[PDB]
Symmetry: C4
Amino acid sequence: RRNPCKFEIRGHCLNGKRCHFSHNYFEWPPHALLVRQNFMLNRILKSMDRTEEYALGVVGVLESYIGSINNITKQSACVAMSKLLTELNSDDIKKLRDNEELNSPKIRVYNTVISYIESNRKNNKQTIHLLKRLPADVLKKTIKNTLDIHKSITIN
Amino acid sequence: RNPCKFEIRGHCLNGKRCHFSHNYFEWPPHALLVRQNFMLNRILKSMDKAELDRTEEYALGVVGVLESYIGSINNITKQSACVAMSKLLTELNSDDIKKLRDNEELNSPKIRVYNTVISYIESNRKNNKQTIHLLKRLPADVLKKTIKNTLDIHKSITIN
Amino acid sequence: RNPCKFEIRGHCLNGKRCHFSHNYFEWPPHALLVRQNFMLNRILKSMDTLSEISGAAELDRTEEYALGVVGVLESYIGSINNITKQSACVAMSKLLTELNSDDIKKLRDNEELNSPKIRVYNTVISYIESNRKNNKQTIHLLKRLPADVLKKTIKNTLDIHKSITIN
Amino acid sequence: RRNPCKFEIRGHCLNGKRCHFSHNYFEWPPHALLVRQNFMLNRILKSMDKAELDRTEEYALGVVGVLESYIGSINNITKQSACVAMSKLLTELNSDDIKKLRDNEELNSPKIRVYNTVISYIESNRKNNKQTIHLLKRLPADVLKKTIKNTLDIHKSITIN
Ligand SMILES: [Zn+2]
Ligand SMILES: [Zn+2]
Ligand SMILES: [Zn+2]
Ligand SMILES: [Zn+2]
């Protein structure tokens, strides 16, 4: 039985006839089929959109900007903020807002984040401007909340 | 290594600090299935064209809102009803209706309604902003009829 | 909790009332598979001017639906079920869309040089490409063809379509 | 039990009521469901995409074959065709995987220069592949071939770990 072409697993094998691995999904085992869909989804999504800031992550960058370390400019923070908002989805926040009792101050912040997520989906270029207009101390508050929600959602 | 739960929902944002797997080849299948679902949802949201965001219109659902507007409860304005109608139409697909219309014998009155819903679904895909205008122009009693039929189809399709 | 069948087809719209699972992590794999298929269909539909062009709104009608695009096209060839030449050309467009050049190129590679099949493969391929660029005019082109040659082309395209799908 | 319609497996069955195979995902077995997603993903991707190397032997070569051939000046690969194929390769690559490799390098490793060069090419290419191909044509043959060779090496490298 021919094994699945690992190039095709990540998308499209580019070796033409030379390549002697399977490119025929019908004979692939399921796990390879699963993995490919993940790479292909990643590509689809990308399509409709420095060394230590990479190793930090968007979270690392943002946490660093808060503690004023690793030389994170406020501009870079705002951009990273945009990337974080994109990774979040309003519906998960709304779900959390529903668990809160009225006039809980958490509800104010949930709605603030939610409105940011929505500005960001419409036009991330200006959402980033907005975020830059904020005074440092309030931007950091917001970032810290967004991060906390982000962590929160992901562990339940 | 277990799969990064952040990555399962999309893209882990912790850089090198995160010590969970981000390598799809070593994930077990179930996680791979789940991630595709979150990612599909994102892709779809991403190519999409304010009252019913509010706390109780969220817990109602679009169906709840619409059923409430029909029975004149939970304070659902006619505007909010029309918007929700748009969200419902979006969730439906013409082909499933056409399949139902084919089971009907000629001059069955059901066929009229199926085609009405179908044309609404199509107006909606073209331009939901005006489809919602249209829907607002309807007299309350006929809008509610339409909504009710659309809801019945929606339920019907989903259980077979 | 079992998976919400509404969510299986996309997005459950019943809010808090609905007592079925909407949490992918607890769904069994088969439901997860099925949902991806409905969602893919929606995504694709969502990035698709046609039903404005003459002859197209026509084949939504009750029997042109039961025929299929293939049925319509095979009917136009045998001059039955009242298929206008306009409707044929539109259906042709829908068929071309369903095909992908790469699968044809793969077949062309199995042919030995100067095999006449290679000419027809390339004709279909070029049609597929006109169609992806601008299906509105591809349909015009197809209408300009003399009936007897259009029917030839349709027949070849259909044969490829069948051929690909069974290997 | 009805088997899954093989036409539907590749997308949308076009035979209407005549077709007696299942088109109901709920009764399909999982493997068919997996296969269909792959064909449908391919279609979706093709659908949001922005002539020489369609020809019979440039197809059997692949984009890699074309590029490797242009480097060794064989199989009659024009420099124009090389540049286009380069674009197709860049598209198949993703910056993030390169960044991951650049992180494994120690500072001032010359590899880092090349990783960033490729990365910036990938990004020009995603923005506007038409001009990325112009750029690539402006390069002197000997440097274009260097770049192509590096890109190919990365491409192979990523794919085997
Ligand atoms: Zn291969
Ligand atoms: Zn992680
Ligand atoms: Zn539900
Ligand atoms: Zn079928």
